[PDB]
RNA sequence: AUGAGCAGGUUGAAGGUUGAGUAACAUCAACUGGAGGACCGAACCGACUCUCGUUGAAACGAUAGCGGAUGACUUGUGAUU
RNA sequence: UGAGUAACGCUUGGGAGUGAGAAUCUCCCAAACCGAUUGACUAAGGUUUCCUGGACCAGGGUCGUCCUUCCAGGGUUAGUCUGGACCUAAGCUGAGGCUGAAAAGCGUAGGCGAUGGACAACAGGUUAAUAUUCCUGUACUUACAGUUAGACUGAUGGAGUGACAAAGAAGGUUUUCCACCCCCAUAAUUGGAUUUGGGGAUAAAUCAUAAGGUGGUACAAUAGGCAAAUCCGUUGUGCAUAACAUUGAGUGAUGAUGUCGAGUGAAUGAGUGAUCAAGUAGCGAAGGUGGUAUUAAUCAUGCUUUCAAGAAAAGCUUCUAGGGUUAAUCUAGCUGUAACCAGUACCGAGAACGAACACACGUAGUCAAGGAGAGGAUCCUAAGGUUAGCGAGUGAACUAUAGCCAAGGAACUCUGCAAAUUAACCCCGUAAGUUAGCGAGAAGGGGUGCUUAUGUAAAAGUAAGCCGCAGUGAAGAACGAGGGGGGACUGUUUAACUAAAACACAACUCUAUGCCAAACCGUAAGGUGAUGUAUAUGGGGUGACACCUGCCCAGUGCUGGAAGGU
C-alpha cells in the first residue's frame, strides 16, 4: 500500500535472459519483511497489471573486502521475480 | 509346569528352563485388548532428580501395562465370564480377560484352577465359595485359600498378588472385627471385617522352578550386573581396599552406605499397624 | 579420532544461547558481568 | 620411514624409454634430461637397425616398444618407421641419433639434452 | 525416546506328521520345522603381537597378522544424571 | 649458534601454445593408481569456499603466467521437496498449589519438544553458475464464492482404525539373466580372416482388468462406553466348501504424431594455419519376440514359530448429543478466485567438516558394472575420477620395506618373539574323554590343467588322449599332537605402557522387608523401589555341573530376656 516494498530493480545476465521470449520476468529487490501477496499488491497499485506469479530469493549476508584494514559484511537482500502474462511488456523506467 | 530348553549351541552348556505357556495359556499369540492397554515408561531405577536410586535396575524390554481390576468393586452383583488366560509381562501371575454381563471387559489376576467359561461374581453378601469369587472377609469360612486381600476398606487388592500366593483364615477376634489371616512367610495379621478378598490360589505355581540359563536373559528381564563390595575400592564401599582377596575386616558386614544391616531389625515399631500383627515370622509382635 | 568438539547448530544454541542464559539467576549474573566487560559477543547467539 | 613413493622401478624405466622412443620416432626431436636421453639412444638405435628388413617378424618385434602418440597411432607410426625413417638409414654403420646438451633448467639446474635423428 | 545396519556360506535343536512298536506308555525309523548369548568369513566394532615413528604424517598412528561379527551387538539423532 | 644442516608429509613422459621468465599454467596424446571406490546423491557441519575476468603484496613447505589466496562483477526461484501454519515420545517449561532462612526445588491444568505419525508432481530441456523450484508437456490436492441435482445435518464428546517385537521359510508378479531376431557402423597388406563393435527406452496421473492377502456374514434384544446413541461391546438365532467388507503388487489403453536414443555431424565466427568453433547446434534408424531348474525388488503393516510379550497423539470412518423443518449443512458435477513463511549455491573431505597445517586420523544413510568366483572376499578393468604441490642424479657405508639363499634345522633366545609350513572346492577316513550337545575342518590322505566323447535344463561326474619341473599353475583363504596351572563358558575393564587368574555372568546361601513396606536422592515437598505385594524387593558373601562344607558362642557383632544394680 505505502509502496516502500519496491526498493530497486536489478539487471543482470539472468534477468535479461528471462526478460525476453513472450512472458517477461522482471526482477526487483523488495523489503525483506514483505510477503508475496504484498509484492503483488504493490505491483498492482504502482504498475497496474496483475502478476501471474511471484518467486522470492533470500541472499544471505557475507564478508566483503576481506583482508582490508576494516572488513565489512554484506546487506540482506530479498529478490522478487514477477512474471507478467503473455504478450505484455511494460517498462521499468518511464511513467 | 516347566519345559527344558536344549540349546545345542557349543558355547558353554546351559540347562535353561521356561514356563510352557502352551498348555497353560489359551492362545499362544499376543493379542491384548486395546481398551485396557497403557504403555509403561522405564524409569531405569532413577528418581525425579535423574540420579540412580535403586541400583541394578535398567535395560528391560518395552512393555505395555494391562489395566488390572484389583478393586473388583465397580461391577458388583454382575456375573462375569472368563474368556482367555493370557501372559502379562508386568507380573509373574497370569491375567484373565473377563467380560461382564452388561458387555464391559476387564483384566483380573487369574485364580489357579479356573478355565475358560467359568463364572465369576463379586458383591458384599455370602455369594458362593467358588474360585475367583470376591467377597468381604466377614463371610468366608475359615480354612479356604484367599488372595487379592484388601488392606484398607474400599481400596484395591494388595496382599497375596504374586504367582502362587495365598492366605488362610484363622477364625475371628473377640473385638467383633479384625478377622485373623495367616499369610505367607508365617506371619499372622488382623484384617478388618469390611475388607474384601478373592478365594483361590494365584496361578503360575511353578514360577519358582524356572531357571535362567544365560546372562542375556536376565539382562533383557531388566537386571544389571551387581558388583560385590569386596571387589570395590576403599572408597565407595566399606568392604573395599585390601591387598588381594580380603575378608570383611570390620566387626560385621556393612551396606554400601555404611550401616550394619545384618540381623538388625529395620521396622518402625511406632506404627498404627503394629497392634494388628500377631507374629513377625519369629515371635510375638 | 573423534575429537571433543563435534559442532551442532542446535546443541550450541540450546545450551549457551541467550534464552538459556535468561532462564536462571546464574545466567542473568553471567550476562551482567559480560555487559560490564562490554563484550561484543555477549552470547553465542550473535555468531554473525 | 614408510609410505614411500613407488620410485624409479624397472617397469617405470622401460615405460619411460618406450614413451621417449615413440615420440622421437614420431616428431624427430626430444627435449629431455641428459641422463634419460643417453638411455633412450640405445633403444632408438636398436629399433632403427632391426627395422631395416621390413618383414612381419620385425613388425612384431618393434610393436613391443612403440606407443601411441599425438601425430601418429601405433599402426601409422609403424608405416612411418618402416617406409620413411628406417629406409633412409640403409647403409649407415650405426649412430642414427645424436644427443647434445642444452643449458640447465631454471627450476632444477639439471642438464637438458636434445635427442634428434642424425641425417 | 525414536530410527538404521550386520555381503555370503554352513551345522541342522525343540516341536509336529507318518510308520513300526506298547495291553495302553516309553522307544526306534523316515519326512517336515528352522532354534542357538551356534560355526567360517567381508562391511562394522575392538585393540593381542612384531617392526617403524618417538623435536611424528599423527599430543597414540602406519603395514602385516589378530578377537567378536543375530547379539550382555554396532550406530545416528534428541533428552537426562 | 646449531646451519644453509634435518625436513619439504603415497603419482610419469612428450608435443603444441601463452608469457619478460615454464619439470610445476592451458590443450592434446599417452602412462600409472582408485574402481563396495580417489566413482555419484544427500543428512550433519562449513558459511560464499560456487561461476566469470583480472593480479601475483602476503599464503602455497620449491616454482608459478597458476591457485579452495586477493580484487571486481554475478549466482541459490516451490500449493506438491526438507521443516513451520498439523500431532505427540523421552524430556523441558509450567498459572494456581506444595515445600524451603533468601535465591529457589517439586508439580496439576495448559504449552513446547523428532530422531516417529498424517499430507497433493512426474518425464524431458535450458544458463558459466539454480532447478521434483525456471520452461514444455501432462496431472493432482486443499480452501472460498456462484450455480445444478440429490440428501437431514450430525461434535470440543463416545467407539473403531491409525497401532507397530525378533527370527525364519514358502509362494504371486515384475525383473536380473539366457536364446533368437531387428537396426547402425565396420570388411581391415604383418601370416590367415568368411567378421568385429555398439544399441534395442519411456514416468507420475486417468480408465478398465487385477494374481492374491486380510476377517466369518446378516437379523433380534439390550442394564455397559462422565449425558445420548441406530456406532462399539455383550448375549442368542439363521446361513456359513461360500457370500459380504476392505486391501492389493502387476497387466492393457491414453499420457506419447511427444521425449530420449546408437551414431552421424556442420554452418557461423575467432585464428597465420591447424585447430577451436565442437564433437557443439541440428539430424537422428531399430526401439522386439520366447524361456528361466538364475537373479533381486514388490505384494508385505502378508504368513509361521518363540519369549525377553513388543510407543503416543493427530488424522480417517462412524454414533448420537447438539442444531435445523419451509432452512442450515453435506455429497457429486460445472464456472471462477487463491495457495503464506524459512532452506535451496558449493564442499561433503589424503585440500572446503572435527583434528592449530593444502595434517597418512575420524564422520549417519543411499546407487553398486563385467570376467572367474558362495560372495559387497580376491586380481584385472567398465561408467567415472586423480596426477598425492619440491625435482634431477648416483646406486658408497648405514637404515626401512620387500625377494632369495647351498648343507644343517631351534644348535638362536628369557620364550619357536618374529619369520616359515597348511590354506579354496570335491572325494575317503577320523581316536582318548564327555555333562552325550561335543571333541572335529580332529589326526591322516588323494584329485584339480587342456582336448574329444558320454553325461545333464545347466552341471558335477565318467572314459580315452595331450603338454609342462610344476595344472584352486598368479590373488585371497586353518600349521598340528600331548601333559599341566587358573578361570566353567559368551562377554566387560585401566581413552594414551598392565585384557589377565581381575570384574561380571547363569546358580547357592544368609539377612531385612506386611505395603504410607524395608532401602535410596533431598533439608523438605516430591520421587525411585513399583502402577510391583513374600513365587516380591534391597543388601552381604560364594560363583557352571558333581561330591562335600568338620569343631569352638570364650572375645566382638546381631537377636531376645524376667526381675536386680548404675
Ligand atoms: Mg522459497
Ligand atoms: Mg539387587
Ligand atoms: Mg531381583
Ligand atoms: Mg581392585
Ligand atoms: Mg570407609
Ligand atoms: Mg576390608
Ligand atoms: Mg592375602
Ligand atoms: Mg610390475
Ligand atoms: Mg555367535
Ligand atoms: Mg634460538
Ligand atoms: Mg645460519
Ligand atoms: Mg652437521
Ligand atoms: Mg648430512
Ligand atoms: Mg635430506
Ligand atoms: Mg608431497
Ligand atoms: Mg614426483
Ligand atoms: Mg588397476
Ligand atoms: Mg567419494
Ligand atoms: Mg574467504
Ligand atoms: Mg573458479
Ligand atoms: Mg583467473
Ligand atoms: Mg613461493
Ligand atoms: Mg510447478
Ligand atoms: Mg509443535
Ligand atoms: Mg522427521
Ligand atoms: Mg551444480
Ligand atoms: Mg594380412
Ligand atoms: Mg451412561
Ligand atoms: Mg490410546
Ligand atoms: Mg545442489
Ligand atoms: Mg579420510
Ligand atoms: Mg581441516
Ligand atoms: Mg599434501
Ligand atoms: Mg558417511
Ligand atoms: Mg565385482
Ligand atoms: Mg577389492
Ligand atoms: Mg623362489
Ligand atoms: Mg631363483
Ligand atoms: Mg638354507
Ligand atoms: Mg634341508
Ligand atoms: Mg637353547
Ligand atoms: Mg646359548
Ligand atoms: Mg606367531
Ligand atoms: Mg584335540
Ligand atoms: Mg594337579
Ligand atoms: Mg574367562
Ligand atoms: Mg573372551
Ligand atoms: Mg591402556
Ligand atoms: Mg594392551
Ligand atoms: Mg518421604
Ligand atoms: Mg509407581
Ligand atoms: Mg569370588
Ligand atoms: Mg573359587
Ligand atoms: Mg565353616
Ligand atoms: Mg553366650
Ligand atoms: Mg543386646
Author numbering:
A (entry chain s): 2 to 96
B (entry chain a): 2 to 286
C (entry chain 0): 1 to 48
D (entry chain m): 2 to 120
The authors write:
Here, we use cryo-electron tomography to analyze the impact of Cm inside the bacterium Mycoplasma pneumoniae.
The in-cell consensus map resolved to the data limit of 2.7 Å at the 50S core enabled us to investigate Cm’s binding and coordination in atomic detail in the context of stalled native translation complexes. In the PTC, 23S rRNA nucleotides (A2459, C2460, G2068, A2069 and U2512) form the binding pocket for Cm. The base of C2460 (C2452 in T. thermophilus and E. coli) and Cm’s nitrobenzene ring interacts through π stacking. The side chain of the residue at position −1 forms a CH–π interaction with the nitrophenyl ring of Cm and the residue’s main chain N atom also forms a hydrogen bond with the CL1 atom of Cm. The lysyl side chain is located at a distance of about 3.5 Å from Cm’s dichloroacetyl group and can be stabilized by aliphatic–aromatic stacking on 23S rRNA nucleotide G2513. We were able to place a corresponding K+ ion, coordinated by 23S rRNA nucleotides U2512, G2068, G2455 and C2509, 4.1 Å away from Cm’s methylene hydroxyl (O4::K+ distance).
